[model samples]
Target: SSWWSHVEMGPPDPILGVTEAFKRDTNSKKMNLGVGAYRDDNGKPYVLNCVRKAEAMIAAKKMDKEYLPIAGLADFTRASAELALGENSEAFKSGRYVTVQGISGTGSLRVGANFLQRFFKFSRDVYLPKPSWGNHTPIFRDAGLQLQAYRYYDPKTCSLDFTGAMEDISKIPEKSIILLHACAHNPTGVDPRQEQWKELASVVKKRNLLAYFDMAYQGFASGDINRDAWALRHFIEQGIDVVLSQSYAKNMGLYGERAGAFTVICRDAEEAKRVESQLKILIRPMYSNPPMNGARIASLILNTPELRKEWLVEVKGMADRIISMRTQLVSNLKKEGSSHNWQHITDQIGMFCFTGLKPEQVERLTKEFSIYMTKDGRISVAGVASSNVGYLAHAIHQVTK
Candidate 1:
């Protein structure tokens, strides 16, 4: 009798579901290492001081809530491009790049995938890292592309499986779309070194694959925007045309606001203009335009000299805190008489640590210790704090020993 008689139950999301379960639990000392969001030393969600100051400044100005352009806030998109591609990028100078506002990292990827589907005559298959962000495969699939995985993480050593990855990449049809994490590679927290990245660029160039970079954690990864952007910039320097998706959720702590940008680099300004036209054509029917408040805040902080400096410093502080947490985590593990290497805990960069805990161990952590995270054993390092690191380490020791 129901109109949705054919509707079926769906499986819980790998990341968000864990958080929901944790929320429902009444455990007094529960720890949420599920989501990649940042938390303070007290294990509470953090709002950056710089963000608060920007909110105050924006509020004082009393800006109108007029609709943003379909492509999003022009100034925000412009500033975002400069921030991602470096101020002196040849792409910026040539005017061959089109930057459009999108929902967030996921939203930006969706837009790019859809645009590629509609316009690009290349392969309809998109290749992703074997252990990429979970949402990527679904996003591209929903956009009418065949999805496949290239080798990435090596479970044995808990490191990048570079040779397998290159071999897989070589098999992809020339000019096929390949998605890359521009920085702070998601669940794994593993990234190739600079030389490794250069080698990857050379292979992609040789294979003639279309590159798409998803940069969700820019300044949040390394505490410096330029350093985080090294890979993408290297590709651009190698004369590779690229598709870029940018997110401000981590760096600016604007998760709810959903601020991000989608960009494409073409051969020349004329091709870029054509791509921009198609992008608007696709976006106009979807959401019409993006919201104004978040972009306004992001643009304000990024464009103004004083606020920009403050924002960078604040982002660096958050990154430094996470780095310190990594050190403390490894130190505490060793102090607890852990014989395992534990070196990878500090070696991996960004907001998460792939602790190499098996699924059974992860279940024990959640059930017995009230510590919540994905079964893949990726814990959000941002969620760890000075107050709880010891307990977390003890949990690890228990599970491993």
Candidate 2:
């Protein structure tokens, strides 16, 4: 006790703290809409059938318990790159890319950040969306990069600030790093239209900014894998090399499996090998090597055509469920005799929705109605199930009115 006496207490994580609070509440009607995890129509955590099938296959094979390469499982890393960059990608075809396995989205992001801190000597500044993921700031900061913001979200409209974003991007000094959410822009659920993305790509290319994409959702966003990845692919096709991280947590329902990959696009195969060697040098001491179970499961699912088809359907089902919840919530609000325009509820896409509720309203929803969400008025619509839509709508109406 004497050795630790000088250490002061620290605050709980804002997001995780919500779950802890939800667990302590005894109310039957209470709901946790804080974390962006998927739930079924009955409000229970749902696991994919494909993942289970993959596990059974692995058990049958009786794979070895040996360690993997520092870069990770060959099949898993290759499949992850294919998942993100597509099978026909020029970069993939030419072997001009390096893909490394990471713990998950967070770990992939940290590894990329650390790489930039060490090798990206042009600038120390990294520009992020104004209201990016809460963890983004600390991730880069801890990696020893200065964090700055470019306008992305508009609180007044609860949507993208396209004009402001373009202006900010045009002004960011050349060669500075910019983080773009390839799809499903997290808390705001606002993503740019195809044409909008095209315009941004031109500006980013003109500015010569280094592109870093965090694509944690992929097929989980639009229910179509290729559609969700269009932006990131377009950038590379238009001659902008990128560093991207992919996660299996949301799309494949492999949340606890911690399966993910990080990739670097290079000018040619030779440079890719060099970059990969350095990446191995950096990661050897970081974790030595990644786990075997998640990678094996992910590899089986992604590589097996039958399991891959089933996985696609499952991803679509989850996306459709979230979409249905959005529609039902708006309809229910109208049924409850609310005069507010809730169109944005349906306008936004992906697993989360920014309700635009003030902090006081969010507090009331938690204290009075037992509906837990972040203070920034963001709610995980994935946490909303069919049975609870009406109840949630009623709670929102009561707080608003």
Candidate 3:
């Protein structure tokens, strides 16, 4: 028998594949709305000024390439937790929070999923939103956990199916794990309101569910880190022992650098220490340790007061740019005489706008208009530029009509 004879070619990735196809196309008008990476008004990749400043400062210091421990840099993990859970979090004060550096959002999720598979004493199934980040399912499934779905998006109103979600979560077995997007939910860009988050917290408390939060886009959502973390902080305040994953890929524009953290809040310091030990054991064989460069740059900015403030401003700028594009896209659709009620385009938050375009319309938009996006009709608002908004709106109108 030939080695690997039974292997079959896998289908292209839904999100990243679109970018690969867009790159190979010879057309100058082709647009890529696939990935969540931020772009400026000119539809060009953006490098934050604060990131540049941090890199320059790090270069000046000439940091060495010492291998980080299996858990990664202490400063980076601590700063990351503080950024997500608030600086004065009781979890942190009680020394009940365990933070470990991971590759990024996806990697952090994998780490948590693996740990849950090995250690969680409850159901082996993990529940995710019906339509969430494409990678979320595989990340958990690959870690030996069964995956299930809960109601999330409502196609009719292009909004959250709150009642449906609550009902579904209520039916899940007690102590089952549920993955939630902390802010700026992927693809749809829809998020639960503050009060809705409180309701969700109560449900989880009543059911004794294991909450796992993935905070991929913090400052990129509402232009304020604290505001974006409202859900996660609220959950912590409710005295829930939760697992959290944070990504610097979007807000910090460190996509390629792969800076992120995986954290677990324990009921007490002893439990926290035990969890940290297990997390290290789980990570040691996987990658041994995370990369140092990204962590160094992120840590420097996050630890320094002045640089941290600058980073916040830069993140807000990126968020504001996306907001402006959303406004422009909606306005242009109206100008193009689209009568399909494009209010959802503005109502959705974060970097993406889940245009309610059907599959055929999305296909037509791509084949006829040379615009590329996921088949599910989610458009990355960050990909829209001032010059292209009118064209996009016209394309959308044609499809809708």
Over 202-240, each residue of candidate 2 has an lDDT whose tens digit, in order, gives 999999999999999998668999999999999999989
Off by over 4 Å in 3: none
Predicted candidate 3 versus true structure: per-residue lDDT over 348-387, tens digit per residue? 8888888877899888878887889898888888888888
Clashing pairs in 2: none
Off by over 4 Å in 1: none
Candidate with top lDDT is 2
**239-337, model 1: which lDDT tens digit per residue?**
999999999998999999999999999899999998899999899998999887778889988998888888889888889999999999999999999
| Count of clashes, each model | 0, 0, 0
What ranking of all candidate models by TM-score puts the best one first? 2, 3, 1
Candidate 2: residue 80 lDDT (0-100): 92
Question: Each candidate's lDDT (Cα)?
Answer: 0.90, 0.92, 0.88
